[PDB]
Structures are given as structure tokens and as C-alpha cells.
Amino acid sequence: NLAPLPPHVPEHLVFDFDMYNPSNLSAGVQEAWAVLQESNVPDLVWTRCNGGHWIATRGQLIREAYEDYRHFSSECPFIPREAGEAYDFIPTSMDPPEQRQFRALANQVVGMPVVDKLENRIQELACSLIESLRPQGQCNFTEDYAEPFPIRIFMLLAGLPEEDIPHLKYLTDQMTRPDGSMTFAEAKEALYDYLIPIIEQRRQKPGTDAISIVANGQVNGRPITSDEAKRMCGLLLVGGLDTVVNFLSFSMEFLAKSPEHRQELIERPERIPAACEELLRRFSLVADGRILTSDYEFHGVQLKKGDQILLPQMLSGLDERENAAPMHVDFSRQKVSHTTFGHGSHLCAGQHLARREIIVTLKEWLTRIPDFSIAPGAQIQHKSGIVSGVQALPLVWDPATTKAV
Ligand code: HEM
Ligand SMILES: CC1(C)[C@@H]2CC[C@@]1(C)C(=O)C2
Ligand SMILES: [K+]
């Protein structure tokens, strides 16, 4: 379904990419998005899919647009417009200077100091999960580890009951990769309906959990409001439930298929943090955007006030102008350039948590299950959206070749 071309959009800039179902998805979702970087596609294009919006395809343009909040506002950051309009999460729906007091609170709850405190718990949950799985010689990685590991950590941090995960996880996914069963707004309001009473409970009798801390936070010489607390906690949930979860699967699918890269990390565990960064570049997975606050000419293209522009975080590290042989995974890549965690004032507040979760997974998995592969003949299917994902990841291994810790 192609929305008719706006008058200011030249025909030669039309490239009808569908971010929710790209044509070459079978090849892998990063491969599919990478068609935007083939020689036939201009650096900045208009797609008529999903209501009609711009797409920047190059690292340099993506970075520039993310720095320039004056022209490119976060107020409406999702495609389609209906989602972007309904999107009211804090701090990401705000531009500076208003954004700044809230970002600092968010940093306080999921930032590095909190990760440092959680190190042992992170280690423990990973080891316990992996030790439980090891004697099986098989798992569906997405549901047996990729989901429970970072989600149980977040749920613990947020002080929310684990029994609520299936319901909460379902709703989160409707905001990033919708079933078609709910609109973005329904899912958001459902999440909000869950949060509202808890936030009230924790303003009256605060705890030490992340939600108590947000709800009782100080921003700008005043306490956060109940509704502001609600909008920040909703975003923290989504970050906790639908980011690392998907990334781990892209990484493990790759490792399962490439024993040499596994052996590299097994024999040289000191290369794991470097590997994690390269994996973050190659299997980048997030794409949101901004909305034009005024008419603006950007790299020779006129944008009209109210135009939406998708600025795919995924695309920067896959840009050959940024990394030679971008689809090639090289753990000793001299300069790993990417914007997987974003760019400008909205750069991911949870990046340290993500990195810790990844590096711990890489270390403890390869230690206990050094040798594994994708199940015989099984076809790996990726899913595309605001955050991309892996639908299923069946793995098999000989437990004899596995090592108990
Ligand atoms: C590999 C994992 C992750 C990736 C790739 C990722 C990606 C991103 C990106 C691209 C942005 C900026 C979006 C924009 O500019 O519109 C962002 C922001 C944010 N992320 Fe992450 N994220 C990850 C993990 C997490 C985790 C685990 C949390 C923990 C709750 C989290 C919490 C947040 C928050 C609160 C923001 C908003 C910061 C602001 O608006 O100032 N993220 N993330
Ligand atoms: C784009 C994101 C990855 C970032 C954290 C969750 C997410 C979906 C957002 O709405 C902000
Ligand atoms: K909005």
C-alpha cells in the first residue's frame, strides 16, 4: 500500500522500502535493510510504504540528523505516524532542553553504577540458565535463554513479578513488531494500565527498586509527576524486554554457524569485549526516526515541516563508507564504527547493561557449551520493525563436548 507522492518529493528519490516487511528478509534482516545501501539507492530516499516517509541510508546523514534536534524532533519518533504520534515515552519523546532532566534520572536507574551493583546477579542468572540447558543437548534459544536472561534481570531490577512476563512481553512486542492484533496505542495504554497502580503504590511506600526510584525521582528542583513517572517506566520496560533479547539471538545464530569465531573467543577470552562491539555493529537491529519541525533542505533534498524521516541506527555500521567489507565479521577489526545504541542526546541510557549482558552470555555460554550448531536443516527466520528480531533459534549440541562449571 503506497501513499501517494507528496508534491515536494522528486520521483527519482522514490524507493519503496517497507521497514516492517522488507523484500529480502529471507537473506537475514541486516542483509534486507542493506539493500538501501546498494548502488541503485540514493543516500536519502522517500518510501510510500507505511504512510510515506524519508529514509537516510548513510552513517554520516544519520549522525547529522540525530545531532540536529532543532530540525529533527523526537516528539514523533516512530513510523507509522499514528505510532509516532501516540508515542509519548520519556525521555525519548522529548527534545532538549526539556529532555535533559529526565535523561539524568533515567541514567540514575539503569546506568553504569546500577550495572556495577548487578554484576554478580547477572553472572548468576546466566550461569544458572546455561547449566540448566547444557545437559539437554538442545534448546530454542530465543525462548529458552535470549528472553528469560535479560528479562528476568530487568524484572528483578524493576521489582516486578516474573509471572507477568508473558503478558508484558507480548504488549512490548506490539509496539516494535506488531502482530496486527493491536495498534501501537492499545498496547501502550495496556502497559500504562499495568504501571499506573504500581507507580501509585511506590510513591506512597517507596522501595529500592527501579520503579520506586523513577516514581520518587527529582527532576529540575521538583518531583517527577505520576504521569511523567508512568511514561518513563513504560520506556524502561520496553528497553528491558525487547532489545538485548533480540540482539542475543542474532549473535548466537552467527556463532552457531561459525566455529572459527567461537574458537577465537574460547581461546582468547580477552577479545570478547572487542568481539561484542563488532557483533553490535554487524547485527545492529534498531531503527526509529524523527519529525521535521520546519521546512529544511538537508543534503540537497527539501524536507517539509511535518515530514517523518527514518534514521536507521542499524544502517550506520553497515555503511561501507564507515566500515570496509561491512557484512564480514572480524573480531580484530581495526576501527569498529557504529551507532547501534543511537547518537546525539538520546544515545541509549541502558548501553552498559546491554554490553554486560552480552559479554556475560558470550563468556559463560562458550565456556559450558563451546560446540553447538543450528538444528539440522532448520531455517532461521528474522522479523523486522522498530527493533528487529529472530523468530526462532533451535540449537543442538553434544553435551559430552560440553563442560560443567
Ligand atoms: C543491545 C541493546 C540495546 C540497543 C541496541 C538499544 C538501542 C537504543 C537506541 C538506538 C536508542 C535511541 C533511540 C532514539 O534516538 O530515538 C536507545 C535509547 C534508550 N534506551 Fe537503549 N538499547 C538497548 C538496550 C537497552 C536496555 C537494556 C535498556 C534498559 C532499560 C535501555 C534503555 C534505554 C533508554 C531509557 C533510552 C532513552 C534515552 C533518552 O531518550 O535519552 N536500552 N536505545
Ligand atoms: C528505540 C528503542 C530501542 C529505544 C529503547 C526502546 C526503543 C524501542 C525505544 O522506544 C527507545
Ligand atoms: K508523540
Side-chain angles (χ1 to χ4, degrees):
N1 193 8
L2 277 20
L5 204 51
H8 67 287
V9 175
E11 196 164 300
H12 62 73
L13 291 187
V14 177
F15 188 79
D16 290 305
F17 184 82
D18 182 355
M19 67 168 287
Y20 285 104
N21 189 50
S23 298
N24 233 288
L25 185 65
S26 324
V29 65
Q30 293 82 10
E31 281 74 5
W33 281 73
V35 311
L36 292 162
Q37 287 168 337
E38 314 287 16
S39 56
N40 59 317
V41 188
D43 284 350
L44 180 56
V45 298
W46 177 268
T47 174
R48 296 171 282 174
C49 300
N50 295 308
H53 67 86
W54 301 98
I55 310 182
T57 68
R58 299 297 160 175
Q60 199 189 10
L61 278 76
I62 297 168
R63 289 188 166 88
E64 289 188 25
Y66 274 131
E67 296 184 11
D68 187 8
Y69 61 89
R70 229 91 56 162
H71 290 106
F72 305 101
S73 175
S74 295
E75 172 213 289
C76 184
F78 280 22
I79 277 74
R81 189 175 298 276
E82 294 77 12
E85 286 179 355
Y87 190 105
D88 60 10
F89 288 148
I90 294 180
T92 91
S93 75
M94 293 165 168
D95 297 314
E98 164 174 66
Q99 179 243 0
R100 151 250 186 286
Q101 284 281 7
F102 300 93
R103 169 168 187 73
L105 179 66
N107 202 83
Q108 169 173 339
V109 301
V110 295
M112 211 228 45
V114 171
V115 179
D116 271 341
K117 194 198 73 156
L118 287 181
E119 265 274 34
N120 273 339
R121 195 72 205 258
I122 296 177
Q123 268 297 113
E124 180 249 346
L125 204 22
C127 287
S128 172
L129 241 14
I130 297 171
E131 193 51 58
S132 168
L133 291 171
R134 179 180 65 79
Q136 302 177 1
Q138 198 266 359
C139 68
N140 177 14
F141 184 80
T142 65
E143 76 176 311
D144 298 343
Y145 183 92
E147 278 168 28
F149 172 63
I151 298 182
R152 291 191 206 165
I153 294 179
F154 178 82
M155 294 298 276
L156 259 25
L157 177 72
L160 299 168
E162 282 187 12
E163 316 94 89
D164 285 343
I165 281 168
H167 176 72
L168 289 177
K169 171 58 177 169
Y170 173 73
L171 295 174
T172 298
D173 289 358
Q174 300 315 302
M175 285 177 291
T176 61
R177 294 177 309 287
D179 269 332
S181 73
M182 298 179 90
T183 65
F184 177 101
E186 313 243 296
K188 190 197 69 184
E189 291 295 339
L191 194 54
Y192 278 173
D193 280 330
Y194 172 88
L195 291 172
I196 291 176
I198 299 174
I199 286 166
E200 178 60 13
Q201 274 172 61
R202 271 115 106 141
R203 300 194 119 212
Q204 292 160 292
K205 285 229 193 169
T208 45
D209 57 287
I211 297 175
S212 290
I213 299 176
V214 176
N216 297 281
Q218 280 301 119
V219 287
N220 228 28
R222 63 160 179 97
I224 186 170
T225 68
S226 302
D227 171 82
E228 287 168 336
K230 188 195 69 184
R231 299 192 279 142
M232 174 163 355
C233 291
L235 170 72
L236 294 179
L237 255 289
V238 173
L241 272 50
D242 201 42
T243 57
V244 186
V245 166
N246 300 296
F247 180 70
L248 286 174
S249 289
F250 289 119
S251 297
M252 203 56 51
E253 171 191 14
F254 172 78
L255 286 180
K257 298 189 297 191
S258 180
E260 295 90 340
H261 285 90
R262 301 203 302 259
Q263 263 309 106
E264 198 181 346
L265 308 183
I266 292 157
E267 300 197 51
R268 304 283 98 103
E270 68 273 5
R271 292 212 243 187
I272 292 187
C276 159
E277 218 56 39
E278 172 69 348
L279 290 178
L280 280 165
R281 183 199 63 82
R282 171 68 172 79
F283 300 109
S284 203
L285 74 168
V286 176
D288 77 346
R290 299 291 189 262
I291 185 168
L292 275 294
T293 62
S294 57
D295 290 8
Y296 187 47
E297 191 199 57
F298 185 58
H299 290 291
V301 189
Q302 250 290 338
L303 317 172
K304 272 291 178 179
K305 167 160 188 174
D307 281 3
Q308 288 180 288
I309 174 162
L310 194 67
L311 302 169
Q313 282 87 352
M314 179 195 310
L315 277 192
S316 303
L318 306 179
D319 196 346
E320 64 275 9
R321 308 167 181 183
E322 305 256 307
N323 303 275
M327 300 313 268
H328 175 51
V329 168
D330 177 9
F331 292 158
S332 75
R333 185 177 283 273
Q334 296 306 114
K335 175 53 199 166
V336 182
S337 179
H338 68 82
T339 60
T340 289
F341 284 118
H343 189 78
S345 62
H346 289 275
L347 193 335
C348 178
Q351 64 176 324
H352 315 90
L353 179 55
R355 276 195 184 88
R356 197 70 228 129
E357 280 168 5
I358 292 157
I359 295 169
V360 166
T361 294
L362 290 182
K363 182 158 206 313
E364 301 306 321
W365 190 278
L366 295 181
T367 288
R368 295 161 171 78
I369 310 172
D371 231 43
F372 57 99
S373 63
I374 293 174
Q379 305 258 313
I380 306 311
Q381 296 163 353
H382 292 177
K383 230 291 196 185
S384 185
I386 299 280
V387 181
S388 290
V390 182
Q391 190 175 29
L393 182 55
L395 300 164
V396 301
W397 59 88
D398 184 1
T401 81
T402 66
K403 297 278 157 179
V405 174

